[PDB]
Structures are given as structure tokens and as C-alpha cells.
Amino acid sequence: MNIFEMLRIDEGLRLKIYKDTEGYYTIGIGHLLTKSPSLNAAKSELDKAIGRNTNGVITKDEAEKLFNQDVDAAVRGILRNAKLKPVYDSLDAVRRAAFINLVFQMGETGIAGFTNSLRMLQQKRWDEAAVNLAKSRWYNQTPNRAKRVITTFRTGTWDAYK
């Protein structure tokens, strides 16, 4: 198991524009297109991201390409972020994948306040961090995915995902 397979389980793959859990226009492997309500604004962004007139549909290859870009940008953002970087550095390989998942999902941004959880993770207080992470809109909105991520942080293994 690796970050790609992990996120592919969490996000699924859809080749036609769809709405995500928050109601946003998405495509592929969790690739957010726009937060606007307009399906046309979504088709426009999609064509712009693909470099072709897509009519809201892409191929598996095109989906995989967006995915590779997005994981690369997720990692790079973490490494550029002064709050994130030290946590990431401190973690083992599995837990690093858990942190990447969290950022892919919610942006460098929204996780902005796992301030307390982040300090807990850096300190390696696994159980306490898992408890703190669970007190979040994140956990309440997408409880099954949150549980898997949380378990990866607690345990440092891929058990939640076999």
C-alpha cells in the first residue's frame, strides 16, 4: 500500500463530472473543479485543466494524470508550509501518507487548525492525537474515511486499508 492506492480507495474514480460530499463539482480521483454552483463554470475549469474540449467527460489516463499532479502538489504544499513541514519531517513513512491524505482532502488551508492535533502528532502521542482529531467537523462529516485516516495515525500501519 502507498499514498496513491490509499487515496484511490478514499476518493474513488469517476470519469464524469460529479458532486463531492460537500456538493462541489469534481471529477476523476477527488480532483475538485470549482466551488461554484455552475456546471458550466465546472466544464470550463475541466477543459482548462485537461487542455481539450471535454464536454464533462475524461479518460482514465487523464484522471490519473490529474491525480499524479494533485498528490505532487499536496506533498509540495506540505513542504512549503512552515506549520506542516516540521510535523511531516517528524513522522514515519506510513504516518506521512496519513498526513498527505488529510491535506489532499482538506487543503493546507482548512487543516489549518488541527493546531493541537499537529502538536500531538509531532510529540508522538498517538492515542491522544486520534482522540483530538475526532473532534472535528471533518470527522463528523466523513466519519468512515476519517476513521481510516485516524487509525493510520494511531497505529502507524495500513491495517484500516487491507
Report the catalytic residues. Answer: 11, 20
User: Using CB atoms within 10 A of its CB, is residue 29 exposed (0-12), middle (13-18) or buried (19+)?
Assistant: buried
Alpha carbon distance 115, 91 (integer Å): 16
Cα separation of 136 and 98, whole Å?
16
Judged by beta carbon, residue 33 or residue 121, the one nearer Cl ion is 33
Q: Is 99 annotated as a binding residue?
A: no
And the C-alpha cell for 46?
Answer: 475541466
- Say if residue 140 carries a ligand binding annotation: no
CB of 119 to Cl ion, least distance (A): 26
Residues 18, 20: Cα–Cα separation, whole Å: 6
Copy the grid coordinates of residue 87.
Answer: 510535523
Query: Which is nearer to Cl ion, 99 or 138 (by Cβ)?
Result: 138
State in angstroms the smallest separation of the CB of 72 from Cl ion. 11
Minimum CB distance to Cl ion smaller for 86 or for 143: 143
Return residues touching Cl ion (CB under 5 A). 49, 142, 144-145
Per the CB < 8 A criterion, the answer to whether 59 and 46 are in contact is no
Q: Could you tell me the smallest distance in angstroms from the CB atom of residue 142 to Cl ion?
A: 4
Looking at the DSSP assignment, which residues form a beta bridge with residue 31? 27
Q: In this complex, which beta carbon is closest to Cl ion, that of residue 10 or of residue 99?
A: 10
CA distances from 87 to 3, 100, 109, 151 (A): 17, 11, 15, 17
Q: Residue 44, annotated ligand binder?
A: no
- Is 32 among the annotated ligand-binding positions? yes
| Residue numbering of the annotated binding site | 32, 104, 117, 132
